[PDB]
Amino acid sequence: VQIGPVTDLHIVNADIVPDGFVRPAVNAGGTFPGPVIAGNVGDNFQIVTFNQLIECSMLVDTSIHWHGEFQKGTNWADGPAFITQCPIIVGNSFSYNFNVPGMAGTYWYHSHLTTQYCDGLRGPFVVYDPNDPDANLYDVDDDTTIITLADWYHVLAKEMGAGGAITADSTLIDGLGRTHVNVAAVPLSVITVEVGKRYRMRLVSISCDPNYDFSIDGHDMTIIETDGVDSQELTVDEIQIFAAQRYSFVLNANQPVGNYWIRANPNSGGEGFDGGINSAILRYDGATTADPVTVASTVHTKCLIETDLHPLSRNGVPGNPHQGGADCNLNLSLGFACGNFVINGVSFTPPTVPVLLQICSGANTAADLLPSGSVISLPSNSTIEIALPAGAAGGPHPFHLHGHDFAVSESASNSTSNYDDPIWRDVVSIGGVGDNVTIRFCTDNPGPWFLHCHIDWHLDAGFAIVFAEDIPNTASANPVPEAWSNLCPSYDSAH
Ligand SMILES: *[C@@H]1O[C@H](CO)[C@@H](O[C@@H]2O[C@H](CO)[C@@H](O)[C@H](O)[C@H]2NC(C)=O)[C@H](O)[C@H]1NC(C)=O
Ligand SMILES: [Cu+2]
Ligand SMILES: [Cu+2]
Ligand SMILES: [Cu+2]
Ligand SMILES: [Cu+2]
């Protein structure tokens, strides 16, 4: 189902059994995954979030992030708890009111309090472009062609320990999937196609953790969009998609009428596809209603390599074509030790007063800002470079920057930089020990922007910092509505 751009979104508890195991959940709009929130580029989104949560087990406070939306002028609407807001308390509501100029493509939204999105608050967000330059490449683009991949846990997020390696109990594709252990023959998701039609498939990782090896038996996939950025056409036969990344790919339904397995292998949890784990069904109209009996290629011969992606537009790369060729070049020391992650020796632990409120109240510098050592100021209109050398305990970490997308100057498993035409995205794997994944952007968006690993268990264990971008201009650029000012006093009173 699609809603928006102006809509109510209620946050409720519901028990669900996507793999046959009933357990509690935190739902947006009453379904798992949440409904698709949608609009056209340039639309005013007004999402009134009614928090009706009752089950403390998963926290009754909530806060929602519109993942990959830049929020320029509306840093207050971004969603991360204690960075841009206090959580909305149960029984109250809050209007995330914002515009999406410049932006089109496939996004998503999720709770950004603690590890609550794991417990089910996650869904797709699609900005349609009525003048999409990729339109002529396909026949069908609609709600039936969105594909979500989700990790699902039998253990309540708040009780995951932490961290402490943690693994999912099943993979859900469009909210259905089978349990990795003691697999019950529960219903699988079906994605129906018609002989000869081309589909814009919108592949969305809503994962709290694992990355997926994604393929469709018998079929190719032509990538045309990455984390919201239009790409040149890239035909692959397998896609490794890390947590919170998105691809649009063209599926040409050119195989014989029949049933073909859709495969998404997580990097942890259940391995293989026995009894239909890690699986969904590609069904052609006219096929018999039966399980596919297809096999993956023994070796995939054209799997996605990030370095083969190129923007469709002439995005290029900011700065100079050498490492340090930026106004403010950074190299973050990403560590793990004793159950906590650090960035430059500091583990993130949420401040009592949100970063933005601190600024609104008169803070001027990162030194003025709490938590100490968890904030780095950026000057305005400057080319930033962030090197993110990997090695820290597992791995591979998908880093995400709020309020921005970014050139991937250097990708995983490859030490050659690209200062001509690398793909731009918003979530990138930092690869493995010895890699030096590097990103670049321009500071054109005043506000405190979260930078964190999108493995949510790694976020709760401190793997994050705030880029306080243009502290001096922050208040002026981001006028807040009174409802936002009301958040922290309510939350603090309630607690
Ligand atoms: C990965 O990339 C960064 C560059 O973006 C490298 O940073 C250099 O590091 C050395 C020592 O750490 C400094 O003396 C230089 O000033 C840095 N060069 C700059 C900032 O241009 C970093 O060493 C690399 N990390 C690796 C390969 O793990
Ligand atoms: Cu996110
Ligand atoms: Cu985000
Ligand atoms: Cu991580
Ligand atoms: Cu985030």
Coordinates of C-alpha atoms and ligand atoms in Angstrom, one line a residue:
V1 CA 0.0 0.0 0.0
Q2 CA 1.2 3.6 -0.7
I3 CA 0.4 6.7 1.3
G4 CA 1.4 10.4 1.2
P5 CA 2.9 12.8 0.8
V6 CA 0.4 14.1 3.3
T7 CA -0.6 11.3 5.7
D8 CA -1.1 10.0 9.2
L9 CA 1.2 7.3 10.3
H10 CA 0.3 5.6 13.6
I11 CA 2.9 3.7 15.6
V12 CA 1.4 0.7 17.3
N13 CA 2.4 -2.6 18.9
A14 CA 1.1 -5.8 17.2
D15 CA 2.2 -9.4 17.5
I16 CA 3.3 -10.8 14.1
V17 CA 4.4 -14.1 12.7
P18 CA 6.2 -13.5 9.4
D19 CA 8.0 -16.8 9.7
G20 CA 5.4 -18.7 11.8
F21 CA 6.9 -17.6 15.1
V22 CA 4.6 -15.0 16.9
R23 CA 6.3 -12.3 18.7
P24 CA 5.8 -8.6 19.6
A25 CA 6.5 -5.8 17.2
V26 CA 6.5 -2.0 16.8
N27 CA 4.7 -1.2 13.5
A28 CA 4.4 2.0 11.5
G29 CA 1.1 2.2 9.7
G30 CA 0.0 -1.2 11.1
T31 CA 1.9 -3.5 8.7
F32 CA 5.3 -5.2 8.3
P33 CA 7.1 -3.6 6.5
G34 CA 5.4 -0.3 7.0
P35 CA 3.4 1.2 4.1
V36 CA 5.3 2.8 1.3
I37 CA 5.4 6.6 1.9
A38 CA 5.4 8.3 -1.5
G39 CA 5.4 11.6 -3.3
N40 CA 6.9 13.3 -6.4
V41 CA 10.2 15.3 -6.4
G42 CA 9.5 18.8 -4.9
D43 CA 6.5 17.7 -2.9
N44 CA 5.8 18.8 0.7
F45 CA 5.7 15.8 2.9
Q46 CA 3.5 16.1 6.0
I47 CA 3.7 12.9 8.0
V48 CA 1.8 13.1 11.3
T49 CA 3.3 10.4 13.5
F50 CA 0.9 9.2 16.2
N51 CA 2.8 7.3 18.9
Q52 CA 0.4 4.8 20.4
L53 CA 3.0 2.4 21.7
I54 CA 2.2 0.5 24.9
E55 CA 4.7 -2.3 25.2
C56 CA 7.7 -1.1 27.3
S57 CA 9.6 -4.3 26.2
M58 CA 10.4 -2.5 23.0
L59 CA 10.2 1.1 24.4
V60 CA 7.1 3.2 24.1
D61 CA 9.0 6.2 22.9
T62 CA 9.7 6.6 19.2
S63 CA 11.5 8.8 16.6
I64 CA 11.5 8.4 12.9
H65 CA 14.2 9.1 10.2
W66 CA 13.5 9.5 6.5
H67 CA 16.6 7.7 5.4
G68 CA 18.5 9.5 2.5
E69 CA 16.3 12.6 2.5
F70 CA 18.6 15.6 3.0
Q71 CA 16.3 17.7 5.3
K72 CA 17.9 21.0 4.2
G73 CA 16.2 23.7 6.3
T74 CA 14.5 21.0 8.4
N75 CA 17.2 19.4 10.4
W76 CA 14.6 19.3 13.2
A77 CA 12.6 16.7 11.1
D78 CA 15.5 14.2 10.6
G79 CA 14.6 11.7 13.3
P80 CA 17.8 10.6 15.2
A81 CA 17.1 10.6 18.9
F82 CA 19.2 13.0 20.9
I83 CA 20.9 14.3 17.7
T84 CA 18.0 16.3 16.2
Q85 CA 15.2 15.5 18.7
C86 CA 13.9 14.1 21.9
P87 CA 11.7 11.0 21.2
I88 CA 7.9 11.5 20.9
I89 CA 6.3 10.0 24.0
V90 CA 3.3 7.5 23.9
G91 CA -0.1 9.2 23.5
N92 CA 1.5 12.2 21.7
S93 CA 1.9 13.0 18.0
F94 CA 4.4 15.0 15.9
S95 CA 4.3 16.3 12.3
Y96 CA 7.4 15.6 10.3
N97 CA 6.9 18.4 7.7
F98 CA 9.5 18.7 5.0
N99 CA 10.3 19.0 1.3
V100 CA 12.3 16.9 -1.0
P101 CA 13.7 19.3 -3.6
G102 CA 16.3 17.9 -6.0
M103 CA 15.7 14.3 -4.8
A104 CA 14.1 11.3 -6.5
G105 CA 14.4 7.6 -6.3
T106 CA 14.2 4.8 -3.6
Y107 CA 14.5 5.5 0.1
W108 CA 13.1 4.3 3.3
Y109 CA 12.1 5.3 6.8
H110 CA 12.9 3.7 10.2
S111 CA 12.8 4.3 14.0
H112 CA 16.0 6.1 14.9
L113 CA 15.7 5.5 18.7
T114 CA 18.0 2.8 20.1
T115 CA 17.5 -0.5 18.2
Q116 CA 13.8 -0.1 17.8
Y117 CA 13.7 -0.4 14.0
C118 CA 14.8 -4.0 14.4
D119 CA 11.6 -4.6 16.3
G120 CA 9.6 -3.7 13.1
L121 CA 9.4 0.0 12.5
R122 CA 10.7 0.1 8.9
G123 CA 9.3 0.7 5.5
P124 CA 9.9 2.0 2.0
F125 CA 9.9 5.7 0.9
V126 CA 9.7 6.4 -2.8
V127 CA 10.0 9.8 -4.5
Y128 CA 8.7 9.5 -8.1
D129 CA 10.1 11.6 -10.8
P130 CA 7.5 12.5 -13.4
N131 CA 10.4 13.2 -15.8
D132 CA 12.6 10.2 -14.7
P133 CA 15.3 9.8 -17.3
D134 CA 15.1 6.0 -16.8
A135 CA 11.3 5.8 -17.6
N136 CA 11.7 4.4 -21.1
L137 CA 13.7 1.5 -19.9
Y138 CA 10.7 -0.2 -18.3
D139 CA 7.0 -0.8 -18.5
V140 CA 6.0 -1.2 -14.8
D141 CA 7.0 0.8 -11.7
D142 CA 4.6 0.7 -8.8
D143 CA 4.0 -0.7 -5.4
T144 CA 4.0 -4.3 -6.7
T145 CA 7.7 -3.9 -7.9
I146 CA 9.2 -2.7 -4.5
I147 CA 11.3 -5.5 -3.0
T148 CA 12.2 -5.2 0.7
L149 CA 14.9 -7.5 2.3
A150 CA 14.6 -7.6 6.2
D151 CA 16.4 -9.5 8.9
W152 CA 14.0 -10.8 11.6
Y153 CA 14.8 -11.8 15.2
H154 CA 12.9 -14.0 17.6
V155 CA 14.7 -12.2 20.5
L156 CA 13.4 -8.7 21.3
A157 CA 15.9 -6.0 20.3
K158 CA 16.2 -4.6 23.8
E159 CA 17.3 -8.0 25.1
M160 CA 19.9 -8.6 22.3
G161 CA 23.3 -8.9 24.0
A162 CA 25.1 -6.8 22.9
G163 CA 27.5 -6.6 21.3
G164 CA 28.3 -9.3 21.4
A165 CA 27.7 -11.0 18.1
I166 CA 24.0 -11.1 17.2
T167 CA 22.2 -13.1 14.4
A168 CA 18.8 -13.0 12.8
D169 CA 16.4 -16.0 12.8
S170 CA 15.0 -15.5 9.4
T171 CA 15.2 -13.5 6.1
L172 CA 11.9 -11.8 5.1
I173 CA 11.4 -10.7 1.5
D174 CA 8.3 -8.4 1.3
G175 CA 7.7 -9.3 5.0
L176 CA 7.5 -13.1 4.5
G177 CA 10.2 -15.7 5.0
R178 CA 11.1 -18.9 6.8
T179 CA 12.9 -19.4 10.0
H180 CA 16.6 -20.5 9.7
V181 CA 16.2 -23.1 12.4
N182 CA 13.5 -25.7 12.5
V183 CA 12.1 -24.3 9.3
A184 CA 8.3 -24.4 9.2
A185 CA 6.6 -24.5 5.8
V186 CA 5.1 -21.0 6.2
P187 CA 4.0 -18.8 3.3
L188 CA 6.5 -17.2 1.0
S189 CA 6.3 -13.9 -0.8
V190 CA 5.5 -14.0 -4.6
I191 CA 6.5 -11.4 -7.1
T192 CA 4.4 -11.7 -10.3
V193 CA 5.6 -10.9 -13.8
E194 CA 4.2 -11.1 -17.3
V195 CA 6.1 -12.6 -20.3
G196 CA 7.8 -9.8 -22.2
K197 CA 7.3 -6.9 -19.7
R198 CA 10.2 -4.9 -18.1
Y199 CA 10.0 -4.0 -14.5
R200 CA 11.6 -1.3 -12.4
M201 CA 12.4 -3.4 -9.3
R202 CA 13.1 -1.3 -6.3
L203 CA 15.4 -3.3 -4.1
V204 CA 15.5 -1.9 -0.5
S205 CA 17.6 -3.2 2.3
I206 CA 15.7 -2.5 5.5
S207 CA 18.2 -4.7 7.4
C208 CA 19.3 -4.1 11.0
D209 CA 22.5 -6.0 10.2
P210 CA 23.3 -8.6 7.5
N211 CA 24.2 -7.8 3.9
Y212 CA 22.5 -10.0 1.2
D213 CA 23.7 -11.7 -1.9
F214 CA 20.6 -11.0 -4.1
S215 CA 19.8 -13.0 -7.3
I216 CA 16.9 -14.2 -9.4
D217 CA 17.3 -17.6 -11.0
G218 CA 17.3 -17.6 -14.8
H219 CA 17.4 -13.8 -14.8
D220 CA 19.7 -10.8 -15.3
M221 CA 19.3 -7.5 -13.4
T222 CA 20.1 -4.0 -14.9
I223 CA 21.0 -1.5 -12.2
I224 CA 19.7 2.1 -12.9
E225 CA 19.7 3.7 -9.5
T226 CA 21.8 3.5 -6.3
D227 CA 20.7 5.0 -3.0
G228 CA 18.6 7.7 -4.9
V229 CA 21.3 8.4 -7.5
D230 CA 20.5 7.7 -11.1
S231 CA 23.2 5.4 -12.6
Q232 CA 24.3 4.4 -16.0
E233 CA 22.8 0.9 -16.9
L234 CA 24.7 -1.9 -15.2
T235 CA 23.7 -5.5 -15.9
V236 CA 24.6 -7.9 -13.1
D237 CA 23.5 -11.4 -12.2
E238 CA 24.0 -10.9 -8.4
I239 CA 23.8 -8.0 -6.0
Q240 CA 25.4 -7.7 -2.7
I241 CA 23.3 -5.1 -0.9
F242 CA 24.4 -3.9 2.5
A243 CA 22.1 -2.6 5.3
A244 CA 20.1 0.5 4.3
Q245 CA 21.3 0.6 0.6
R246 CA 18.9 0.7 -2.3
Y247 CA 19.1 -0.3 -6.0
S248 CA 16.5 0.1 -8.8
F249 CA 17.1 -2.6 -11.4
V250 CA 15.3 -3.5 -14.6
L251 CA 14.0 -7.0 -14.7
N252 CA 13.2 -8.2 -18.2
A253 CA 10.7 -11.0 -17.9
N254 CA 12.2 -12.9 -20.9
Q255 CA 12.4 -16.4 -19.5
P256 CA 9.8 -19.2 -20.1
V257 CA 6.6 -19.0 -18.1
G258 CA 7.3 -20.7 -14.8
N259 CA 8.4 -20.3 -11.2
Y260 CA 11.9 -19.0 -10.4
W261 CA 13.5 -18.7 -6.9
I262 CA 14.4 -15.2 -5.6
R263 CA 17.5 -15.6 -3.5
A264 CA 18.9 -13.3 -0.8
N265 CA 21.7 -14.9 1.2
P266 CA 22.6 -13.0 4.4
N267 CA 26.3 -12.9 5.4
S268 CA 25.3 -14.3 8.8
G269 CA 22.5 -16.5 10.1
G270 CA 21.2 -19.4 8.0
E271 CA 23.3 -20.4 5.0
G272 CA 21.7 -21.8 1.8
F273 CA 18.1 -22.2 0.8
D274 CA 16.9 -25.5 2.2
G275 CA 13.2 -25.6 2.7
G276 CA 12.9 -22.2 1.2
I277 CA 14.8 -20.0 3.7
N278 CA 16.3 -16.9 2.2
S279 CA 13.8 -17.2 -0.6
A280 CA 10.8 -15.8 -2.4
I281 CA 9.1 -16.7 -5.6
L282 CA 9.2 -15.1 -9.1
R283 CA 6.0 -16.2 -10.7
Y284 CA 5.0 -15.7 -14.4
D285 CA 1.3 -15.3 -15.1
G286 CA 0.3 -18.6 -16.7
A287 CA 2.7 -20.7 -14.5
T288 CA 1.4 -23.5 -12.3
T289 CA 1.1 -22.4 -8.6
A290 CA 4.0 -24.4 -7.3
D291 CA 7.4 -23.9 -5.7
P292 CA 10.2 -23.1 -8.1
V293 CA 12.6 -26.0 -8.7
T294 CA 15.3 -23.7 -10.2
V295 CA 18.9 -23.6 -9.3
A296 CA 21.3 -20.6 -9.0
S297 CA 24.2 -20.4 -11.4
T298 CA 27.1 -22.4 -9.9
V299 CA 29.2 -19.3 -10.4
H300 CA 27.6 -15.9 -10.9
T301 CA 29.5 -14.3 -13.8
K302 CA 28.7 -10.6 -13.5
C303 CA 28.0 -9.8 -9.8
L304 CA 27.8 -6.1 -8.8
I305 CA 31.2 -4.5 -8.1
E306 CA 30.7 -1.0 -6.7
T307 CA 33.5 0.5 -8.9
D308 CA 31.6 -0.4 -12.1
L309 CA 28.7 2.0 -11.1
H310 CA 28.7 5.5 -12.7
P311 CA 26.2 8.3 -12.1
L312 CA 24.0 9.0 -15.1
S313 CA 24.4 12.7 -14.4
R314 CA 27.8 14.5 -14.6
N315 CA 28.2 14.5 -10.8
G316 CA 32.0 14.1 -11.0
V317 CA 33.8 14.5 -7.7
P318 CA 34.5 17.6 -5.6
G319 CA 38.0 18.8 -4.8
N320 CA 41.4 17.6 -6.0
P321 CA 42.4 14.3 -7.6
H322 CA 44.7 13.1 -4.7
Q323 CA 44.1 12.0 -1.1
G324 CA 43.7 15.1 1.0
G325 CA 42.5 17.1 -2.1
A326 CA 39.8 18.7 0.0
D327 CA 39.3 21.7 2.2
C328 CA 38.7 19.6 5.3
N329 CA 40.1 16.1 5.0
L330 CA 39.5 13.6 7.7
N331 CA 40.6 10.2 8.5
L332 CA 38.6 8.5 11.2
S333 CA 40.0 5.9 13.5
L334 CA 37.3 3.3 13.7
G335 CA 37.9 0.8 16.6
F336 CA 36.1 -1.9 18.5
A337 CA 37.1 -3.2 21.9
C338 CA 35.5 -4.6 25.0
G339 CA 32.0 -4.7 23.4
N340 CA 32.0 -1.1 22.2
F341 CA 32.8 0.7 19.0
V342 CA 34.7 4.0 18.9
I343 CA 35.3 6.7 16.4
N344 CA 38.6 8.5 17.3
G345 CA 38.6 6.8 20.7
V346 CA 35.1 7.8 21.7
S347 CA 32.1 5.5 21.8
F348 CA 28.8 7.4 21.1
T349 CA 26.4 7.5 23.9
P350 CA 23.3 9.8 23.4
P351 CA 23.4 13.2 25.2
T352 CA 20.6 14.2 27.6
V353 CA 19.9 17.3 25.4
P354 CA 19.8 16.7 21.6
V355 CA 22.7 18.1 19.7
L356 CA 20.4 20.6 17.8
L357 CA 18.6 21.9 20.9
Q358 CA 22.2 22.5 22.4
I359 CA 23.0 24.6 19.3
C360 CA 19.6 26.3 19.4
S361 CA 20.3 27.2 23.1
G362 CA 23.6 29.0 22.1
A363 CA 26.4 26.4 21.7
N364 CA 28.8 27.6 19.0
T365 CA 31.6 25.0 18.6
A366 CA 32.1 21.3 18.8
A367 CA 33.9 21.9 22.1
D368 CA 30.8 23.5 23.4
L369 CA 28.7 20.4 22.4
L370 CA 27.9 17.1 24.2
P371 CA 28.7 14.3 24.2
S372 CA 32.4 15.3 24.6
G373 CA 34.5 14.0 21.7
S374 CA 31.5 12.8 19.8
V375 CA 31.1 16.0 17.7
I376 CA 33.2 17.4 14.8
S377 CA 32.4 20.8 13.4
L378 CA 32.5 21.3 9.6
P379 CA 32.7 24.8 8.0
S380 CA 30.2 25.8 5.4
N381 CA 30.8 25.6 1.6
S382 CA 33.8 23.3 2.0
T383 CA 34.9 20.1 0.2
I384 CA 35.0 17.4 2.9
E385 CA 36.8 14.1 2.5
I386 CA 36.3 11.3 5.0
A387 CA 38.5 8.3 4.8
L388 CA 37.1 5.3 6.8
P389 CA 39.8 2.6 7.1
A390 CA 38.4 -0.7 8.1
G391 CA 39.6 -3.4 10.5
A392 CA 37.3 -3.0 13.4
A393 CA 35.5 -6.1 14.6
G394 CA 33.0 -7.3 12.0
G395 CA 32.7 -6.0 9.4
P396 CA 31.9 -5.2 6.7
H397 CA 30.4 -2.1 8.1
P398 CA 28.0 0.0 6.0
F399 CA 28.6 3.7 7.0
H400 CA 25.8 6.2 6.4
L401 CA 25.9 10.0 6.5
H402 CA 22.6 11.9 7.2
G403 CA 21.7 15.1 5.3
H404 CA 23.9 14.1 2.4
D405 CA 24.9 11.8 -0.3
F406 CA 28.6 11.5 -1.3
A407 CA 31.1 10.4 -4.0
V408 CA 32.6 7.0 -3.2
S409 CA 36.1 8.0 -4.1
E410 CA 37.4 4.6 -3.0
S411 CA 35.3 1.4 -2.7
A412 CA 35.8 -1.8 -0.7
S413 CA 38.4 -4.5 -1.8
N414 CA 40.1 -2.0 -4.1
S415 CA 42.8 0.5 -3.3
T416 CA 42.5 2.5 -6.5
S417 CA 40.7 5.8 -6.0
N418 CA 38.2 7.3 -8.5
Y419 CA 38.3 11.1 -8.8
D420 CA 36.5 11.2 -12.2
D421 CA 33.2 9.4 -12.2
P422 CA 32.6 7.2 -9.1
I423 CA 29.0 6.5 -8.1
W424 CA 27.4 8.8 -5.5
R425 CA 25.4 7.1 -2.7
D426 CA 24.4 7.5 1.0
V427 CA 25.4 4.2 2.5
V428 CA 28.7 2.5 1.6
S429 CA 30.4 -0.7 2.8
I430 CA 33.9 0.2 4.2
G431 CA 35.1 -3.3 3.2
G432 CA 37.8 -5.2 5.0
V433 CA 41.1 -4.8 6.9
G434 CA 43.5 -2.7 4.8
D435 CA 40.8 -1.0 2.7
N436 CA 40.6 2.7 2.8
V437 CA 37.0 3.5 1.6
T438 CA 36.8 7.2 1.1
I439 CA 33.9 9.6 0.6
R440 CA 33.6 13.3 -0.4
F441 CA 30.9 15.9 -0.2
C442 CA 30.2 19.6 0.0
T443 CA 28.9 21.3 3.1
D444 CA 25.7 22.9 1.7
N445 CA 23.4 21.9 4.5
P446 CA 23.7 23.5 8.0
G447 CA 22.7 21.2 10.9
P448 CA 24.1 18.3 13.0
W449 CA 24.3 15.2 10.8
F450 CA 24.7 11.7 12.1
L451 CA 27.5 9.5 10.7
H452 CA 27.2 5.9 11.8
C453 CA 27.4 2.3 10.9
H454 CA 24.0 1.1 9.8
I455 CA 24.4 -2.2 11.7
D456 CA 22.0 -1.1 14.3
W457 CA 23.6 -3.2 17.0
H458 CA 26.8 -1.4 16.2
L459 CA 25.1 1.9 16.5
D460 CA 23.8 1.0 20.0
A461 CA 27.4 0.0 20.9
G462 CA 28.6 3.5 20.0
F463 CA 29.7 3.4 16.3
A464 CA 28.8 7.0 15.5
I465 CA 29.7 10.7 15.5
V466 CA 27.9 14.0 14.6
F467 CA 29.2 16.3 11.9
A468 CA 28.0 19.6 13.3
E469 CA 27.9 21.3 10.0
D470 CA 28.0 25.2 10.1
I471 CA 27.2 25.6 13.8
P472 CA 26.9 29.4 13.6
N473 CA 24.3 29.4 10.7
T474 CA 22.4 26.3 12.1
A475 CA 19.6 28.2 14.0
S476 CA 18.9 30.6 11.2
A477 CA 18.7 27.9 8.5
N478 CA 16.5 25.6 10.6
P479 CA 13.5 27.4 12.2
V480 CA 11.7 24.9 14.5
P481 CA 8.0 24.6 15.0
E482 CA 6.7 24.7 18.6
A483 CA 5.8 21.0 18.6
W484 CA 9.6 20.3 18.2
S485 CA 10.4 22.6 21.2
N486 CA 7.7 20.7 23.1
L487 CA 9.4 17.3 22.6
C488 CA 12.2 17.4 25.1
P489 CA 10.1 18.9 28.0
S490 CA 7.5 16.1 27.5
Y491 CA 10.1 13.4 27.3
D492 CA 12.0 14.6 30.2
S493 CA 8.9 15.0 32.3
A494 CA 7.7 11.5 31.4
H495 CA 11.1 10.0 32.4
Ligands
LIG1 C1 43.8 5.9 4.1 O1 43.7 7.2 3.7 C2 44.1 8.3 4.4 C3 44.1 9.4 3.4 O2 42.9 9.9 3.0 C4 45.5 8.1 4.8 O3 45.9 9.3 5.6 C5 47.2 9.6 5.7 O4 47.7 9.0 6.8 C6 49.0 9.4 7.3 C7 49.2 8.6 8.6 O5 48.0 8.0 9.1 C8 49.2 10.9 7.5 O6 50.6 11.2 7.7 C9 48.8 11.6 6.3 O7 48.7 13.0 6.5 C10 47.4 11.1 5.8 N1 47.3 11.6 4.5 C11 46.4 12.7 4.3 C12 45.4 12.9 5.4 O8 46.3 13.1 2.9 C13 45.6 6.9 5.7 O9 46.9 6.8 6.1 C14 45.1 5.7 4.9 N2 44.8 4.7 5.8 C15 45.1 3.4 5.5 C16 45.6 3.0 4.1 O10 44.7 2.4 6.3
CU2 CU 19.2 5.0 8.1
CU3 CU 19.9 8.5 7.2
CU4 CU 29.2 -1.9 11.9
CU5 CU 20.8 7.2 10.7

